[PDB]
Amino acid sequence: HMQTKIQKYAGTAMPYPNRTMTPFYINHLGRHGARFPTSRKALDKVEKVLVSAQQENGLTSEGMALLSMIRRLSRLFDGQWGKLSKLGETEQEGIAGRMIRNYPQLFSNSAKIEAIATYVPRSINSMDAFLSCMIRHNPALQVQRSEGKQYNHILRFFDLNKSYVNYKEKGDWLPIYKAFVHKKISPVPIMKKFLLNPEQYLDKEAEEFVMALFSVAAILPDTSIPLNLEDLFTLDEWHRYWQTQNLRQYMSKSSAPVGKMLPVAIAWPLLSEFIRSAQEVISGKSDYQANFRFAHAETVIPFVSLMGIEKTDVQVCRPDSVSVYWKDYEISPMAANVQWLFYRDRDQRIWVKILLNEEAAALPISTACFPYYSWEKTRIFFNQRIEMAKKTLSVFN
């Protein structure tokens, strides 16, 4: 289907997909829901280009239309940047709703749940929407709710690690990304529909215009604004745009060889915390029925690769090949989430199921009863992942 594939090409801007025994505990991490754009850079650039053209009589008919809409968008986004949208809230109500309905026993009576979020409002509002749905279904829940910079160590590790911040900003992946954009993004066919003399434009300025335009269009379906630009581009053009953003995500935030696993290793404190909270619930030190955490794409992506969920930590030496093996939209769409579901069988042995975006995920260890894995084997495996992460990090101060 062309419709679903077009949405995929929004990559990490993709709206959460459609998703329409009982565990004793659920361990959760969840990106905020669908949001407004975080930066006005792409919009202003697209507008600076159009408006400068409207002066030198350089706009086509479709060009004139685009500019009017771009100006309007500029208005609608004003003061709204980075905020959670109505769609974002409904995504959370739906995730929480499906959990409640699927495991009513878990959240029945006076179950205790705890939730944390980062200081980022879109993350907090996400938690709120998620929590509000839960309480509505069972007003008798005990709920502990908190948030702030004090969770920076486990929810924003990507800001704390000096080496990573240097890598993300000025590291070796940049030139690679930039050469790949040049190869894959053919600007002129696209600019031809908005501008007279598309050929007069420099590849650099042309490439920027067109990237900014893809970015605007990519984010629009997340704003709950009844406007659409997905139509300005052909499927192939979206395919190409996406391949480039996909490569950026992979190299900047995941297991690309050029990153040396630095982007993945930084998530070890979060994995560590996940294991502790489950162990404490297993021992009975804690007695929560669920821990929920609300954070970002930058939290989810490396976390998932660090968990070793199959096809997320792959190390692809060749850039042009990443799109085949690693799909950002499958990992970190809007409202992306990981849930560990813990079960106890008839003989008291603990099993765990790993859901990524509410689909059962695979680990590179064996089980006689997929999708359930032995908690003991699993924890040993995660503990190895963590120890590897600590070494990786030790190689980079």
Numbering used by the authors: 19 to 38, 48 to 424
Lines from the paper:
We determined that prominent gut bacteria express homologs of the mammalian InsP6 phosphatase (MINPP) and characterized the enzyme from Bacteroides thetaiotaomicron (BtMinpp). The Vmax value for InsP6 (178 μmol/mg/min) is the highest yet reported for any member of the MINPP family, being several orders of magnitude greater than that for the human (0.006 μmol/mg/min) and avian (0.7 μmol/mg/min) representatives (Ali et al., 1995, Cho et al., 2006). BtMinpp folds into two domains, an α/β domain and an α domain. The active site in BtMinpp is lined with predominantly basic amino acids, thereby rationalizing how the enzyme can bind unusually highly phosphorylated substrates such as InsP6.
A second structure was solved by difference Fourier analysis at 2.42 Å resolution in which the inorganic phosphate ions are displaced by the nonhydrolysable InsP6 analog, myo-inositol hexakissulfate (InsS6), again bound in the active sites of both molecules (Rcryst 15.6%; Rfree 21.7%). Comparison of the structures of analog- and phosphate-bound forms revealed an rmsd of 0.20 Å for Cα atoms suggesting limited conformational changes occur between the two states. InsS6 is bound in the active site with its 3-sulfate group occupying the position taken by inorganic phosphate in the enzyme-phosphate complex and presumably that of the hydrolyzed phosphate group in substrates. This conclusion is consistent with the sulfur atom of this group lying 3.1 Å from the imidazole Nε2 atom of the side chain of H59. Indeed, in our crystal complex with InsS6 one of the E325 side-chain carboxyl oxygen atoms is only 3.3 Å from the ether oxygen bridging the 3-sulfate to the inositol ring, the analog to the phosphate-leaving group in InsP6. The structure of the InsS6-protein crystal complex rationalizes the ability of BtMinpp to remove the 3-phosphate from its natural substrate, InsP6. However, BtMinpp also removes alternative phosphates from InsP6, indicating that the enzyme’s active site can bind substrate in alternate orientations. In particular, the structure of the protein in complex with InsS6, a substrate analog, gave insight into the reaction mechanism. We propose that H59 acts as a nucleophile for cleavage of the 3-phosphate from InsP6, with E325 in an HAE tripeptide being the proton donor for the leaving group. There is 52% sequence identity between human MINPP1 and BtMinpp for those active site residues that have an atom within 8 Å of the InsS6 bound to the bacterial enzyme.
